[PDB]
Amino acid sequence: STAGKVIKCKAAVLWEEKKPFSIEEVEVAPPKAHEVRIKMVATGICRSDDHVVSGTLVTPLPVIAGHEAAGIVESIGEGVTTVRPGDKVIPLFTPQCGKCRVCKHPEGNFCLKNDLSMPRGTMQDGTSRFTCRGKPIHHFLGTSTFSQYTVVDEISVAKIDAASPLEKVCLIGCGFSTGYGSAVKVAKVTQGSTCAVFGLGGVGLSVIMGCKAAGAARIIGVDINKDKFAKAKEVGATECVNPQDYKKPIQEVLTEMSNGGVDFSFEVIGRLDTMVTALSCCQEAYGVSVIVGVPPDSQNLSMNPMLLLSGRTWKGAIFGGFKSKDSVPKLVADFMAKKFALDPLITHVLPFEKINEGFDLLRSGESIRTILTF
Amino acid sequence: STAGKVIKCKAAVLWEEKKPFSIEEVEVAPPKAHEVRIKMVATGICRSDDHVVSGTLVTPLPVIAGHEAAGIVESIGEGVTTVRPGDKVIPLFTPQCGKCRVCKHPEGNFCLKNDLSMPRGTMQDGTSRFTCRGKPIHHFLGTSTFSQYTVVDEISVAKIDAASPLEKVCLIGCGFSTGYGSAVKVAKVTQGSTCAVFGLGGVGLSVIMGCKAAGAARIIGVDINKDKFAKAKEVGATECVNPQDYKKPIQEVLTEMSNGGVDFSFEVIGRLDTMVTALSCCQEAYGVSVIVGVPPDSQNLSMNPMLLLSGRTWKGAIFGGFKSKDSVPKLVADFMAKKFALDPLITHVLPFEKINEGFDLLRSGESIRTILTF
Ligand SMILES: NC(=O)c1ccc[n+]([C@@H]2O[C@H](COP(=O)([O-])OP(=O)([O-])OC[C@H]3O[C@@H](n4cnc5c(N)[nH+]cnc54)[C@H](O)[C@@H]3O)[C@@H](O)[C@H]2O)c1
Ligand SMILES: NC(=O)c1ccc[n+]([C@@H]2O[C@H](COP(=O)([O-])OP(=O)([O-])OC[C@H]3O[C@@H](n4cnc5c(N)[nH+]cnc54)[C@H](O)[C@@H]3O)[C@@H](O)[C@H]2O)c1
Ligand SMILES: OCc1c(F)c(F)c(F)c(F)c1F
Ligand SMILES: OCc1c(F)c(F)c(F)c(F)c1F
Ligand SMILES: [Zn+2]
Ligand SMILES: [Zn+2]
Ligand SMILES: [Zn+2]
Ligand SMILES: [Zn+2]
């Protein structure tokens, strides 16, 4: 029995940038008031986790990363009402406090309680539940899913279907929901439209899924890795283009292909140059471009505002625009009801102990999502 | 008495940047097929006309500028169906061909026949109707309203109510419609919202009018010229701020005043720095910023795309997003029915012959709109 006790378990600790994860014993404190301690079942490897390793994302180190996951509630702190021990849950890397001006807004999802903008690497109360070799270890996005056990604030966890296959639905914790929502909710892709999707990883494939669900007539995948094209076509891409095959800039190619610009474009990579290319390739009077990717910390892009003055719309979003705690249980119900597929995103299933091998698969271009199983 | 004949008349010719207009005789050719020759009655001085003088806006010189105007059809070319001699008309600096992909789109207005993106300074057929001193003179935006007579393509003119007061409704040809539409159509300002309007000239006052018509609860005017504040409050601003009065950047001031960012912001000046400031000051998760001001030619802004990733929407528009030929007659009808006021924008009236004094008034900061009468 572990309730009320410190748990000693295995986790993947990141001690410094640009080094492998260290798989070793940590101590996980019991949950305080309004906190939930979760036994992890499965976690995906998202490129955003790799950004912490590479220094593309700055967050306090040392850290337990991981934000795309599913598990089972081990215990609850005083005052928790939304989950109980034994419940299947998905941690929410974007919280939903329900009380802030964003949570109360019909179209906001970036709750002011988030730990993304100005990361502290703590629980809501400004403390950590993790130690390792006698040192405090930071949280990541209020989730820290690269551990056999984590502790999250109640506002950062959603209860899901007890019959959920956790090794699949962990993807609703980040990559699927982000891409799918970016298309259906943030862009609001229209029936018969032409879309361009820059980046054909797990998130870009989920954007394709959403564009197809929304009835797009044409979905042009763009990637410099042609090995990504076959799966992009399987989930709905009608064409794929590799910028490296062209003498012209790809914005010009895509404008020509779409007879004057696309209806909707998506940046799903994380590069400043592809953000401006994606904006430019949408039709100048009525096009919409959505930034999904995460670029290198503190770097500015350069652009000509005439791109906007003609009528383009440029937007971005976290987690597909979904209000996280309302949406995650509905997405899992929709998955259970066969409304979308997750298997096309899963290329590799490894034990948690092989986390580093999973990151190497992502970095080499081989994988879409590796699911780590605890 | 002049149908089919060259007309000699006075126009304001701009031979050189950064010089006064030359009021002198020009020859105005009769209209060719699908062209309309207009006797001008009134034209406003818009800051975009001054941009041609200053080189902020690059268009071929020498030129007859002017784009905000109203007049009476003198004659029609072969095949014209939409106006007749003696009709009151407003030239449309954004055409509406009705046939291109943008004209057919429900939300597009930047018709592909425009002469704004890559100005040629001609009629649609690539030629000029103007001669001065025996030399061909460029058109401007297909309108060239700083002339006693102009010739426009049929897709660049709208018939308006025969009882229209042309000395007022000329403002529907640019500044009013632009500002009002930027609020009501492009931003879609909501009831009870907080708006920030950067620049309190004729266009920014028109934005305020639209924000107030849309039911905004707070409308914060921003200008470095505090002489602009009284009129801004008369048309609906709830409070005005001068960035020069503050130690901190105004985006910080406006974020504080709005308890975390505004719902809608508008750049109505034409500076790269205020475009980024205006984006920054809208709430990071659900705010909308609209670029209205014309940026200096060929210059790029620098910005951090994290401003968009959190959820902001950034857009721009020409002519308030209005499909020009459909909308201008409706706007005139609404003015006739007192659905909005134009007099607050008109600070000065001058004869056409005093055009240069009119530009001096704008450059000094004294005027909002000067209306020139032919
Ligand atoms: N906004 C959000 O909430 C959110 C959520 C999840 C992921 N992300 C970010 O989204 C991005 C994609 O994540 P992912 O799908 O896991 O990554 P991924 O699996 O590494 O996919 C990126 C894809 O981009 C391709 N690519 C790289 N450079 C280029 C280029 N120059 N042109 C075209 N294609 C190129 C690359 O080959 C790969 O297939 C990353 O920056 C993530 O950090 C954001
Ligand atoms: N998008 C369109 O269709 C469209 C239409 C009409 C005008 N415009 C542009 O809109 C802009 C405004 O036109 P207008 O109202 O005729 O011009 P205007 O009357 O010159 O008004 C501009 C206002 O900006 C103020 N201003 C100048 N610098 C700053 C600063 N740093 N901070 C805050 N306020 C400042 C200035 O004092 C003035 O009151 C110009 O750039 C026009 O070219 C665009
Ligand atoms: O992949 C989701 C994700 C993001 F979209 C970020 F913007 C971020 F900073 C981060 F850490 C993250 F995990
Ligand atoms: O004031 C309207 C207006 C614009 F919005 C422009 F973008 C432009 F180039 C121009 F010449 C113009 F007159
Ligand atoms: Zn909240
Ligand atoms: Zn992620
Ligand atoms: Zn058109
Ligand atoms: Zn104008």
Contact between B221 and B240 under an 8 Å Cβ cutoff? The reply is yes
Residues in chain A: 374
Closest CA to A312 of A341, A281, A342: A281
Question: Angle at which helices B272-281 and B250-257 pack, to 10 degrees?
Answer: 20
Cα–Cα distance, B187 to B165 (Å, whole number): 29
Q: Confirm or reject contact between A287 and chain B (CB < 8 A).
A: no
Per the CB < 8 A criterion, the answer to whether A80 and A34 are in contact is yes
Q: How far are the Cα atoms of A2, A88, A205, A283, B116 from residue A280, in angstroms, in the given order?
A: 55, 43, 21, 8, 17
Radius of gyration (C-alpha) of chain B in whole angstroms = 20
- B16, B54 in Cβ contact below 8 A? no
Q: Which of B308, B318, B319, B324 to mutate to test the interface with A (most CBs of A within 10 A)?
A: B308
Spatial distance between the Cα atoms of A103 and B173, rounded to a whole number of angstroms: 41
* Residue of A58, A310, A318, A324 best to disrupt the B interface, most CBs of B under 10 A: A310
3-state secondary structure of B104: helix
DSSP B128-180: -SEEETTEEEB-STTT--SBSEEEEEGGGEEE--TT--HHHHGGGGTHHHHHH
Nearest alpha carbon to residue A176 among A44, A26, A289: A44
Among this protein's residues, is A48 annotated catalytic? yes
**Maximal CA-CA distance, chain A:** 65
B281 is catalytic: no
**Could you tell me the two tokens for A49?**
């986790």
Ligand 4 mutation target, pool B138, B178, B318, most atoms within 8 A of CB: B318
Token duo for residue B62: 């020498």
Which of B95, B87, B88 is closest to B67 using CA atoms?
A: B95
Q: What is the SS3 assignment for B291? A: strand
H/E element, B309:
helix B306-309
Q: Do B286 and A105 touch (CB under 8 A)?
A: yes
Closest by Cα among A316, A69, A276, A332 to A185: A316
Maximal C-alpha separation, chain B: 65
Q: At what angle do helices A272-281 and A250-257 cross, to 10 degrees?
A: 20
Selecting from A286, A312, A315 the residue whose C-beta is nearest the C-beta of B312 gives: A315
Using CA atoms, how far apart are residues A325 and A155, in angstroms rounded to an integer?
8
Q: Does B101 touch chain A (CB under 8 A)?
A: yes
CB neighbours of A113 closer than 8 A, spacing ≥ 6? Answer: A95, A97, A100, A124, A153, A155
Residue from A294, A298, A324, A362 whose mutation best tests the ligand 3 pocket (most atoms within 8 A of CB)? A294
Helix, strand, coil abundance in chain A, percent, nearest 5: 30, 25, 45
Cβ of B52: how many Cβ atoms within 10 Å?
Answer: 22
d(CA B237, CA B246): 19
Coil/strand/helix, residue A19? coil
DSSP state of B228: G
Q: What is the resolution of this structure in A?
A: 1.2
Q: Is the Cβ–Cβ distance between A76 and A85 less than 8 Å?
A: yes
Name, in order, each residue with C-beta under 8 angstroms of A332's C-beta and a sequence gap of 6 or more. A90, A160, A161, A164, A169, A172
Angle at B42 between CA B321 and CA B330, to 5 degrees: 35
- What lies within 8 Å, CB to CB, of B132 at 6+ separation is B11, B13, B24, B25, B26, B27, B62
What type of residue sits at position B106?
P
